């Protein structure tokens, strides 16, 4: 379901902040 | 302190270790203390009731 891909997308977005900044 | 001369003191030692074992079990399932602070680090509050 779309929601399961959306949940894992949101976790990867919060872990990408280890590696990037504005 | 338990008496190591007699079985009654060996049972007290065992029961003391089971009490310590149970107190660790309650600290497994306990949540962190969460606190929110502002710029300048003043405490606003402890957070409880998050999803």
């Amino acid at each position: 379901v779309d929601d399961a891909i959306a949940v894992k997308n949101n976790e990867v977005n919060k872990q990408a902040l280890t590696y990037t900044r504005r | 302190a338990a008496d190591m001369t007699t079985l009654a003191g060996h049972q007290q030692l065992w029961d003391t270790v089971m009490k310590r074992r149970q107190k660790r079990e309650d600290e497994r399932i306990a949540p962190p203390l969460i606190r929110l602070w502002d710029g300048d680090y003043k405490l606003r509050g402890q957070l409880v009731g998050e999803r």
Partner: protein
């Protein structure tokens, strides 16, 4: 004229524990102190010792201990 700094304390850990009808931020001046303890299930007689300073005769504080049961019929 604002109303007096009358406070409601709710010891429930989820809500703002100390609040005032004046709108004053009385969560400051509490200096990290919180109410921590509940009245446990099947607690009988308790004496609550309050004390007050800077109050006049006829001022009333109150306590509520709201009784919430898992059932309509028993468990006492």
């Amino acid at each position: 004229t604002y109303p007096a700094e009358n406070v409601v304390v709710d010891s429930d850990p989820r809500e703002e524990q100390v609040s005032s009808e004046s709108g004053s931020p009385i969560w400051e001046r509490m200096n990290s102190v919180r109410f921590l303890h509940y009245i446990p299930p099947y607690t009988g007689e308790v004496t609550f010792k309050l004390s007050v300073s800077g109050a006049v005769p006829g001022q009333i504080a109150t306590l509520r201990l709201p009784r919430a049961w898992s059932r309509p019929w028993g468990l006492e």
